[PDB]
Ligand binder design. Structure first.
Ligand SMILES: [Zn+2]
Ligand SMILES: [Zn+2]
Ligand SMILES: [Zn+2]
Ligand SMILES: [Zn+2]
Lengths: 749, 130
RNA sequence: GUAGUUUGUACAGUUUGAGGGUCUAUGAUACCACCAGGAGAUAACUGUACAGGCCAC
């Protein structure tokens, strides 16, 4: 009996504990690791749980935590040295009030530059720059307040172009893909970063809240200079790289000053509000700052709340700076609690219905959304805890020289580069340069030299997909005979004004030999279906075709642009459609047929795309992939982007075939960005996803006429990965030379 | 191999320097009465690593005659298996045995018992009678 | 609220990597000397726990 009680001590040595009652899902499991949070079944499995590499990293994590948990408390000489270190960080290159004036001069100069071209726009310095919660080499936060009679991507692009033309604010970037689309630049006079945003008045009100707190308390100004210098010394500040924003770090230390007993900043909502309730705190909407001492609030009756304690209590900056890292390494639960400073009380994840596996912070004036959503990967979070550990290990250890401290790179980085989760795919285990789904990085395997025999093989493979599916002229004769017969039948039965016009699979250039007879109806004296009772015509024609002993498969459909009837000719056994003055679908089909009629290579490449998508399990939208219509659209988009544009833009008004298709695969692997640009015809410009706001969707393959739904907005990103794998295979299986059996070339492909 | 085969037992073998003598009961596939003595070296043992022989174990060899006496050119175990070595490579931490190892071990876990005095109070490296 | 096409980290088993005092040669009658308390170091596949990513209902 006691043998098992002694054997379990080795398990208990690293966080294994037996569970009294069965879990709702982990029923048969009996044991649990505190560090792994994964239920365990039996003792031999627990030793098998000991061998887990996840449990191996967790043990080192806990050992580091316990190692620097018990550093000796700082001496008064140590406190004085820490105070000297934080004031020299704050004064030598950290933003002082003099450097705050320098930042204000920078923003005023940039405002002069912008208002020279955009006088209706107005620049507001805000954010981590102005708040006196800054850093030595911060990025300036600037909001643009503009009249609403303009496009926000258009003004952002214009500001980006102005800054690119400007020679002072160098290093202009167009990061329009983050949670806030921001222009980036670098002020040369200060030599520090600057950024441009617009419309984030919630963060402007938060900035005013923080700056009022700063005019109240003095330790405000050095504390986040020190904290943000640690944060940029560990590369946690890059929210684009899965980190946490600098403004969120400002809010983090504001919550610290709120919660560091005895408190040094008062909260915004409290007991002085008679009739206040913690649960309905989101209903207490706040407003701007009055006299830099109060915050306004109003319910749709109003009032103001203090931002000051009536005595600015003075404690040493070194003690504050050490206990900040104490709080945010060993005292405050980073993931369990949302960092919420609207109330002194602890606010959980489900209280704002947010996930529970990383850090969440709330914007004071945007309490609906989590501003700390950029934390995704668990490994990056554990590295962040490790960097907090390295900071607390150094700064609470006495030094030799004489006590002296300096924010060295190597003491906190420990030589290890930061665990940057991939900013493109947001998946751990690989860096930004290691993203497989990155379109632009697919260049690691340049092609072997293209033999002309290989070119002939590719030409034959691309040609066979068309010629095996090309309709013959006798089918055209049969279809026009069925056309005139159906015209005579509908005229003699339903309405003599009915005239027939072949379109679609008979006449779009994409139909096959046994395709459907898609026929448009026209009425004498009627140029549109709006004047016609479409449902009555559809149902009467359906009844009459049912009465026809020569036409079968009759069925009305109302899901098209105008209601249609699908049927089948019994004698030819040929399916077909009847469409009444299609509103747009017919115009789009006519435009596609005109694009086909401009160059038959469009039909050749499209048939090749259809067959190659079929063999790569992505044949049509009936199988969940891109439609053959979408395939034709992206083919036409490639022909546009293959400069000089092989097809033109109708709305704006000599490569070999196998190499044309291989160049389509090459373009849709690496020469084109799906997440950044739009596959659409309407403009010759490389239409960005930021222009059309389809950054939330995977692939922006947009119809030039059907602007309502992006075709790729119906297509998943894992289907995007599948078709990207198909394109890469076309670069490899179809794009590298091979000499298979005659007729088996495409089958081998 | 060479026609001068043989079989027998291991009379003696030094682990440290790596040679010995075998009591051969067979000579070139023909049984002997009485057995004779044939020299063996560690290099004659067709094994990888630091080859060695356990005294008293059975061996099959191909031998030769030299000036110093009979010497076994190539020596293996019965059926071509590897040899053992003089025995006077780590035990299972689950069970204290070379029979299995811990991943292979499926018996329920054992208390931390010292090997020398067979007591669960202490570990064997801190045994008082060691 | 739920399915769909998918990343990591672990998961149990299988197949390969050190066999886990590994390592170390000194060719003709002797070596094995002198312990840690530690549940075993990768690559591949299968099944998978969990969050992240996505499209539709
Ligand atoms: Zn565990
Ligand atoms: Zn990636
Ligand atoms: Zn065992
Ligand atoms: Zn003992």
């Amino acid at each position: 009996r006691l043998g098992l009680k002694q054997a379990e001590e080795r398990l208990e040595r690293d966080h294994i504990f037996r569970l009294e009652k069965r879990s709702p899902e982990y029923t048969n499991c009996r044991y649990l690791c505190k560090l792994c949070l994964i239920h365990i079944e039996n003792i031999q499995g627990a030793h098998k749980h000991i061998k887990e590499k996840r449990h191996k990293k967790n043990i080192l994590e806990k050992q580091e935590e316990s190692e620097l948990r018990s550093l000796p408390p700082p001496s008064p000489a140590h406190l004085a040295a820490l105070s000297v270190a934080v004031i020299e960080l704050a004064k030598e290159h950290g933003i002082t009030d003099d450097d705050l004036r320098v930042r204000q001069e920078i923003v005023e100069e940039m405002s002069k530059v912008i208002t020279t071209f955009l006088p209706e726009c107005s620049l507001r310095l805000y954010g981590s720059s102005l708040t006196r919660f800054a850093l030595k080499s911060s990025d300036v936060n600037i909001d643009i307040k503009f009249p609403p009679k303009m496009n926000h991507p258009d003004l952002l692009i214009k500001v980006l172009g102005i800054l690119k033309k400007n020679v002072l604010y160098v290093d202009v970037e167009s990061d329009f893909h983050a949670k806030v689309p921001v222009v980036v630049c670098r002020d040369r006079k200060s030599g520090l970063l600057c950024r441009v945003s617009a419309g984030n008045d919630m963060a402007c009100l938060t900035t005013d809240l923080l700056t009022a707190l700063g005019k109240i308390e003095p330790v405000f100004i050095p504390l986040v200079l020190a904290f943000r210098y640690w944060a940029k010394l560990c590369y946690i500040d890059s929210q684009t790289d899965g980190g946490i924003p600098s403004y969120c770090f400002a809010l983090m230390v504001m919550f610290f000053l709120q919660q560091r007993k005895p408190p040094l900043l008062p909260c915004l909502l409290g007991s002085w509000i008679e009739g206040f309730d913690p649960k309905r705190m989101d209903d207490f909407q706040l407003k701007g700052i009055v006299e830099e001492k109060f915050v306004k609030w109003e319910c749709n009756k109003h009032g103001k709340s203090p931002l000051a304690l009536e005595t600015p209590n003075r404690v040493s900056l070194g003690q504050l700076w050490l206990e900040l890292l104490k709080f945010y390494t060993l005292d405050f639960a980073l993931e369990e609690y949302v960092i919420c400073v609207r109330i002194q009380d602890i606010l959980t994840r489900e209280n704002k219905n947010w996930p529970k596996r990383r850090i969440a912070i709330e914007d004071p004036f945007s309490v609906k959304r989590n501003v700390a959503r950029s934390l995704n990967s668990q490994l990056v979070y554990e590295y962040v805890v490790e960097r907090f550990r390295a900071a607390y290990r150094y700064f609470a250890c006495p030094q030799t020289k004489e006590l002296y401290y300096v924010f060295d790179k190597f003491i906190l980085t420990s030589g290890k580069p930061p665990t940057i989760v991939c900013s493109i795919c947001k998946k751990d285990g690989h860096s930004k340069n290691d993203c497989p789904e990155d379109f632009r990085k697919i260049d690691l395997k340049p092609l072997p030299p293209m033999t002309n025999r290989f070119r002939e093989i590719l030409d034959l493979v691309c040609k066979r997909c068309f010629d095996e599916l090309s309709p013959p002229c006798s089918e055209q004769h049969n279809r026009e005979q069925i056309l005139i017969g159906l015209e005579k039948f509908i005229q003699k039965e339903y309405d003599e004004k009915a005239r027939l016009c072949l379109f679609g699979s008979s006449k779009n250039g994409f139909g096959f030999r046994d395709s459907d007879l898609d026929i448009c109806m026209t009425l004498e004296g009627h140029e549109n279906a709006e004047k016609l009772n479409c449902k009555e015509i559809i149902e009467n024609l359906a009844k009459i075709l049912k009465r026809h002993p020569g036409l079968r498969n009759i069925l009305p459909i109302t899901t098209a642009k105008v209601p249609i009837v699908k049927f089948e000719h019994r004698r030819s056994g040929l399916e077909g459609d009847i469409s009444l003055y299609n509103t747009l679908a017919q115009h789009n089909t006519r435009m596609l047929a005109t694009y086909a009629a401009i160059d038959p290579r469009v039909q050749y490449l499209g048939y090749t795309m259809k067959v190659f998508a079929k063999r790569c399990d992505i044949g049509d939208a009936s199988r969940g992939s891109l439609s053959s219509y979408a395939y034709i659209l992206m083919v036409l988009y490639f022909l546009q982007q293959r400069k000089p544009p092989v097809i033109p833009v109708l709305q704006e008004i000599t490569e070999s075939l196998g190499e044309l298709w291989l160049g389509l695969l090459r373009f849709y692997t690496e020469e084109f960005d799906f997440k950044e640009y739009v596959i659409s015809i309407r403009q010759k410009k490389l239409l960005t996803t930021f222009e059309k706001q389809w950054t939330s969707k995977c692939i922006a393959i947009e119809d030039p006429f059907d602007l309502n739904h992006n075709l790729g907005a119906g297509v998943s990103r894992k289907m995007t990965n599948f078709i990207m794998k198909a394109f890469i295979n076309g670069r490899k299986l179809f794009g590298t030379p091979f000499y298979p059996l005659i007729g088996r070339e495409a089958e081998y492909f | 191999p060479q026609l001068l085969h043989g079989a027998g037992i291991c009379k003696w073998f030094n682990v440290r320097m790596g040679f010995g003598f075998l009591s051969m009961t067979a000579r070139a596939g023909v049984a002997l009465d009485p057995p004779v003595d044939v020299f063996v070296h560690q290099s004659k043992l067709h094994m990888e690593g630091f080859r060695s022989l356990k005294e008293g174990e059975a061996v099959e060899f191909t031998f030769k005659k030299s000036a110093k006496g009979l010497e076994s050119i190539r020596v293996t175990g019965p059926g071509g298996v590897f040899c053992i070595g003089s025995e006077r490579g780590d035990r299972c931490y689950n069970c204290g045995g070379l029979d299995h190892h811990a991943k292979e071990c499926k018996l329920p876990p054992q208390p931390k018992k010292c090997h020398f005095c067979q007591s669960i109070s202490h570990m064997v490296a801190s045994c008082p009678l060691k």
